[PDB]
Design a protein around this ligand. Structure first.
Ligand SMILES: CC(=O)N[C@@H]1[C@@H](O[C@@H]2O[C@H](CO)[C@H](O)[C@H](O)[C@H]2O)[C@@H](O)[C@@H](CO)O[C@@H]1O
Ligand SMILES: CC(=O)N[C@@H]1[C@@H](O[C@@H]2O[C@H](CO)[C@H](O)[C@H](O)[C@H]2O)[C@@H](O)[C@@H](CO)O[C@@H]1O
Ligand SMILES: CC(=O)N[C@@H]1[C@@H](O[C@@H]2O[C@H](CO)[C@H](O)[C@H](O)[C@H]2O)[C@@H](O)[C@@H](CO)O[C@@H]1O
Ligand SMILES: CC(=O)N[C@@H]1[C@@H](O[C@@H]2O[C@H](CO)[C@H](O)[C@H](O)[C@H]2O)[C@@H](O)[C@@H](CO)O[C@@H]1O
Lengths: 142, 142, 142, 142
């Protein structure tokens, strides 16, 4: 089994304040589950080869997803910003598989990824524990 | 816009204790978002014609989903029990649309639904406010 | 150190839905901390001889406190109902110490406590793990 | 009644991740209640003349309290850092009243407060809505 524990840091009040509005788990590797403990969010998965997505919305209306998973025994992550209301995590998560439009960024097995939304909000996923079955990462909004 | 606010009541410690492990929103009607306030869970949707699903897991390993939405301006709900680990909410939610295997129970536009899992856990969704754009319902595990 | 993990069961929608509105920790035994994990609430204490209180309010306005702690290496609990708005947990917790009017109930070291409020809400605290440093209890609103 | 809604921003992972470990409400002005909604924390009070405290602990073990309230119809705030484990919020909140050693800081009715802890963690409380009965503030760990 694999687990990924996320700590969420929001740096800049100017960018608004984000909260989770959706949490999905992909059906590969025997699925998995999100849980919360001490302000953190942990994705527990039945094995290597699946993932999950957290969608955030700011009190300014901005919508973004954070994807984390394990691909061939190595952690991966991605961030998608500038989402329309209809582009829910339910739509996004499957796009990393079956030759979907996001599978390429899963295949990179990134230990860190950052991007800045068209509206000017910076986002970063950085793994602090990059090896083993108990993975850790920070999610930073700025 | 439509919103559905859920209060979760767990009645019987013998059945274990459930917590949310996944939350999905379907992409119709301009999507939607889950939010938590005062222990309750609210699904806010851009209009009539979409839905969302909460998946629960008990500390005894039992997995079940609760689906709520609005179909042609009337509320609906459903409960699916006896799920395998790979049957995530991500898999379940879309099954209510595109002539999927659960669309029939969405079309009923039920104001109340109850079922008992094969392992003996009772589940009920009962709307306390059944009309208008601000819908309310209790979710009861027993 | 000692810990007490609580699982909250709410059995009867007719009594309203309760949520936590305050959490205190008494300052003996090197204090302690409340944390949430998987829908449960854990009080971690620096040793034997302290306690904490959760105050709950129903959406019908009813106010009650649940007290749990360790006294001379044995778990204790109490429930106070019919609280006025000014009787916050900050007022209640200390009443269990220093000639306070509730000290006697700490001294009982109860592994179970039941009480019904004047307005008719049943409350129970029942420890499921009653020995050791990792205690567990169900809190039942009926 | 008065309310104060807090949004918590954590800017620097190097200082560790903070979570709430205690929430108190002082017993003047008919008391009050803490509630969570969309990742924010609201203290609702029965009138002017009371307050509440959130105690935070970082995963590095640092302990700090944030106090907010209304004094003579104006918002106030304070931050106390370098707390020992036994200095719980239950100890801190009352120190703002009755010849307590922190009463002076309530009397200042500050709309902003900044302080850096001895171990090097910056803390700020900044009200974004500074007038009326529905107050708003950002809490920034830097
Ligand atoms: C070892 C590993 O990470 N494999 C990845 C695949 O995961 C497997 O997928 C199958 C279903 O096809 C099944 O669910 C297995 O349990 C699961 O481990 C899969 O994610 C592919 C997708 O391109 O990547 C790896 O091969
Ligand atoms: C009015 C209503 O509830 N209509 C339902 C449909 O919802 C619409 O779906 C389309 C896409 O096909 C689009 O997203 C609209 O915004 C949305 O209102 C749809 O849910 C169907 C599915 O069978 O049922 C109703 O017709
Ligand atoms: C062993 C035990 O539970 N003792 C209880 C006391 O707790 C001790 O309290 C002192 C106070 O200075 C100190 O904080 C110790 O750390 C702590 O163990 C205390 O709760 C008394 C209060 O009546 O009851 C027990 O003796
Ligand atoms: C108007 C106001 O903020 N007054 C403050 C006091 O609050 C009053 O306190 C009394 C105490 O009996 C009572 O609870 C009232 O409801 C409440 O408004 C109190 O906080 C004092 C303490 O120094 O400061 C102000 O005067």
């Amino acid at each position: 089994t694999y687990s990924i524990t996320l700590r969420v840091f929001q740096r800049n009040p100017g960018r608004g304040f984000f909260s989770i509005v959706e949490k999905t788990v992909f059906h590969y590797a025997n699925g998995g589950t999100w849980s919360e403990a001490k302000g953190t969010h942990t994705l527990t998965m039945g094995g290597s080869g699946t993932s999950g997505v957290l969608r955030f919305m700011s009190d300014k209306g901005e919508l973004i997803t954070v994807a984390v998973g394990v691909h061939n025994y190595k952690r991966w992550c991605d961030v998608v910003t500038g989402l329309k209301p209809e582009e829910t995590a339910l739509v996004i998560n499957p796009q990393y598989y079956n030759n979907g439009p996001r599978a390429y960024t899963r295949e990179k097995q990134l230990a860190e990824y950052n991007v800045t939304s068209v509206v000017g909000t910076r986002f970063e996923v950085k793994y602090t524990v990059v090896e083993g079955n108990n993975l850790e990462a920070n999610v930073i909004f700025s």
